[PDB]
Design an enzyme around this catalytic site. Structure first.
Site, mmCIF file in Angstrom:
data_model
loop_
_atom_site.group_PDB
_atom_site.id
_atom_site.type_symbol
_atom_site.label_atom_id
_atom_site.label_comp_id
_atom_site.label_asym_id
_atom_site.label_seq_id
_atom_site.Cartn_x
_atom_site.Cartn_y
_atom_site.Cartn_z
ATOM 1 N N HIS A 41 8.811 -18.657 -12.777
ATOM 2 C CA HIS A 41 9.017 -19.342 -11.490
ATOM 3 C C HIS A 41 10.278 -20.147 -11.303
ATOM 4 O O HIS A 41 10.524 -20.670 -10.225
ATOM 5 C CB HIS A 41 7.819 -20.162 -11.070
ATOM 6 C CG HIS A 41 7.525 -21.361 -11.913
ATOM 7 N ND1 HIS A 41 6.522 -21.332 -12.864
ATOM 8 C CD2 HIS A 41 7.965 -22.640 -11.851
ATOM 9 C CE1 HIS A 41 6.395 -22.547 -13.391
ATOM 10 N NE2 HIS A 41 7.259 -23.361 -12.814
ATOM 11 N N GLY A 142 9.151 -31.354 -13.742
ATOM 12 C CA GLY A 142 10.108 -31.212 -14.815
ATOM 13 C C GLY A 142 9.507 -30.737 -16.123
ATOM 14 O O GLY A 142 10.235 -30.275 -17.003
ATOM 15 N N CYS A 144 7.527 -28.188 -16.790
ATOM 16 C CA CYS A 144 7.387 -26.772 -16.970
ATOM 17 C C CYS A 144 8.326 -26.258 -18.051
ATOM 18 O O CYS A 144 9.516 -26.693 -18.171
ATOM 19 C CB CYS A 144 7.611 -26.039 -15.646
ATOM 20 S SG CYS A 144 6.100 -26.135 -14.667
HETATM 21 C C1 LIG Z 1 6.590 -26.854 -13.059
HETATM 22 O O1 LIG Z 1 6.994 -25.760 -12.131
HETATM 23 C C2 LIG Z 1 7.772 -27.757 -13.239
HETATM 24 O O2 LIG Z 1 7.753 -28.734 -13.983
HETATM 25 N N1 LIG Z 1 8.825 -27.394 -12.454
HETATM 26 C C3 LIG Z 1 10.119 -28.111 -12.329
HETATM 27 C C4 LIG Z 1 10.104 -28.975 -11.209
HETATM 28 C C5 LIG Z 1 9.073 -28.976 -10.248
HETATM 29 C C6 LIG Z 1 9.086 -29.829 -9.117
HETATM 30 C C7 LIG Z 1 10.197 -30.636 -8.929
HETATM 31 C C8 LIG Z 1 11.262 -30.644 -9.853
HETATM 32 C C9 LIG Z 1 11.212 -29.813 -10.980
HETATM 33 C C10 LIG Z 1 5.438 -27.577 -12.372
HETATM 34 C C11 LIG Z 1 4.675 -28.587 -13.288
HETATM 35 C C12 LIG Z 1 3.598 -29.391 -12.545
HETATM 36 C C13 LIG Z 1 4.225 -30.328 -11.480
HETATM 37 C C14 LIG Z 1 3.350 -31.566 -11.534
HETATM 38 N N2 LIG Z 1 2.709 -31.505 -12.902
HETATM 39 C C15 LIG Z 1 2.890 -30.303 -13.459
HETATM 40 O O3 LIG Z 1 2.353 -29.961 -14.521
HETATM 41 N N3 LIG Z 1 4.524 -26.481 -11.961
HETATM 42 C C16 LIG Z 1 4.248 -26.327 -10.625
HETATM 43 O O4 LIG Z 1 4.700 -27.032 -9.730
HETATM 44 C C17 LIG Z 1 3.412 -25.180 -10.315
HETATM 45 C C18 LIG Z 1 4.357 -24.014 -9.990
HETATM 46 C C19 LIG Z 1 3.581 -22.694 -9.777
HETATM 47 C C20 LIG Z 1 4.548 -21.678 -9.078
HETATM 48 C C21 LIG Z 1 3.118 -22.088 -11.085
HETATM 49 N N4 LIG Z 1 2.579 -25.471 -9.159
HETATM 50 C C22 LIG Z 1 1.261 -25.303 -9.269
HETATM 51 O O5 LIG Z 1 0.646 -25.053 -10.371
HETATM 52 C C23 LIG Z 1 0.629 -25.623 -7.904
HETATM 53 C C24 LIG Z 1 -0.846 -25.556 -7.741
HETATM 54 C C25 LIG Z 1 -1.493 -25.821 -6.541
HETATM 55 C C26 LIG Z 1 -0.871 -25.687 -5.291
HETATM 56 C C27 LIG Z 1 -1.653 -25.941 -4.153
HETATM 57 C C28 LIG Z 1 -3.011 -26.299 -4.241
HETATM 58 C C29 LIG Z 1 -3.631 -26.413 -5.478
HETATM 59 C C30 LIG Z 1 -2.867 -26.167 -6.611
#
Ligand SMILES: *[C@](O)(C(=O)NCc1ccccc1)[C@H](C[C@@H]1CCNC1=O)NC(=O)[C@H](CC(C)C)NC(=O)/C=C/c1ccccc1
Length: 300
Positions: A41, A142, A144
């Protein structure tokens, strides 16, 4: 004495973590040999709406990647997609690559999380993969790409987790290093609902053995239940089944208390502690595995 959830030391893993930027999206990757593994992603045009990954991958251009290890640039040569991860071939090899393998966790396995931000480790902690293929972690934006690992007796690092998802409940999901998402959750920002967590019976038995060996015995009932009867009760009350009684033979011998007596005590203690504690816990604890209890009471 004492029982404490610990992490295996993180030094060998800390040197494997890198910053991966695609466009304006920044997250972590794991640099082993000349390959950087990261969550796919990172090439999503947005992670707040459904992602067409085939389209995002085929539109991807190498020059939009910026991969760096502690501020030092790392050239990108190639990218392949494997389930929910990218394997980014880079032009330098990590000379601190530890001896390692890839391994897939099963529910009940303990492992270590190195929580990282922008290519840098901030924290390390032990966790268990739950029956519902989630973990209870602590991650913000951050995180991920943060890796999960175990260190074998010989020093071999088993890379087993890569952080990807925070479910709407707050629970956490990753993939393994092949790109299989644990539990077959989907790497989409859509609402997905995990099964209800089952308490890990095997761990709770270990915990009670640890309490006996630390002189905490008030909860001990003079009752016995066998594995079949306990397993039937466990379905009805949110507990897994219990494995072989014999796994616990060293602890049964050291304490004089059979598993079957511990199984009954779990039944009774499921009703609550009545304001008392065991090793400081106010309800039953399924954080520790048998291997962890043995290592922390005897393992030298
Ligand atoms: C991960 O992508 C990450 O750390 N990305 C870098 C980043 C993200 C946002 C701003 C700046 C940098 C995050 C990790 C999440 C964020 C909060 N705590 C975490 O563990 N992963 C995500 O945001 C997921 C991305 C998906 C495309 C896999 N989002 C989800 O799992 C969303 C789930 C959800 C959406 C709506 C309703 C219910 C659940």
């Amino acid at each position: 004495s004492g029982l404490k959830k610990m992490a295996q030391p993180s030094g060998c893993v800390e040197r494997c973590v890198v910053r991966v930027c695609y466009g304006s999206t920044v997250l972590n990757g794991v640099w082993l040999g000349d390959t950087v593994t990261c969550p796919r992603h990172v090439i999503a045009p947005s992670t707040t709406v459904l992602i067409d990954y085939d389209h995002a991958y085929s539109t991807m251009r190498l020059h939009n990647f910026s991969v760096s290890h502690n501020g030092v640039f790392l050239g990108v040569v190639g990218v392949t997609m494997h389930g929910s991860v990218l394997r980014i071939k880079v032009s330098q090899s990590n000379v601190h690559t530890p001896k390692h393998v890839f391994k897939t966790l099963k529910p009940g396995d303990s492992f270590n999380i190195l929580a990282c931000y922008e290519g840098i480790a901030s924290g390390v902690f032990g966790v268990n993969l739950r029956t519902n293929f989630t973990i209870k972690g602590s991650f913000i934006n951050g995180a991920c790409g943060s890796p999960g690992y175990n260190v074998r007796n010989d020093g071999t690092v088993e890379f087993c987790y890569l952080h990807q998802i925070e479910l709407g409940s707050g629970a956490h999901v990753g993939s393994d290093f092949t790109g299989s998402v644990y539990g077959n959750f989907d790497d989409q920002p859509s609402l997905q609902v995990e099964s209800a967590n089952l308490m890990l019976s095997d761990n709770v038995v270990a915990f009670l053995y640890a309490a006996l060996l630390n002189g905490c015995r008030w909860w001990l009932c003079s009752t016995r239940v066998n594995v079949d009867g306990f397993n039937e009760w466990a379905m009805a009350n949110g507990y897994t089944s219990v494995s072989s009684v014999e796994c616990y033979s060293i602890l049964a011998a050291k304490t004089g208390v059979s598993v079957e007596q511990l199984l009954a005590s779990i039944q009774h203690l499921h009703e609550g502690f009545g304001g008392k504690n065991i090793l400081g816990y106010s309800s039953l604890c399924d954080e520790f595995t048998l291997a962890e209890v043995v290592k922390q009471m005897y393992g030298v």
